[PDB]
Amino acid sequence: FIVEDDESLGHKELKVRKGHIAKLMATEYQDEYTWSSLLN
């Protein structure tokens, strides 16, 4: 998991957020993100 040091919200944070993993959940239960489509 990548981390940017700087943050407008402050201290230090990993870049990935709740919306991305929500989209991953939606694509899994679709039955258009992939692992590669997160990588790009």
């Binding site: 929500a22 959940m25 939606a26 239960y29």
Partner: peptide
């Protein structure tokens, strides 16, 4: 505390259906 011994998934899928 809740301490999360167990977790739910589709209830949250539904919560994001209302959120989006």
């Amino acid at each position: 505390t809740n301490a999360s011994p167990f977790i739910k998934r589709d209830r949250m899928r539904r919560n994001f259906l209302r959120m989006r």
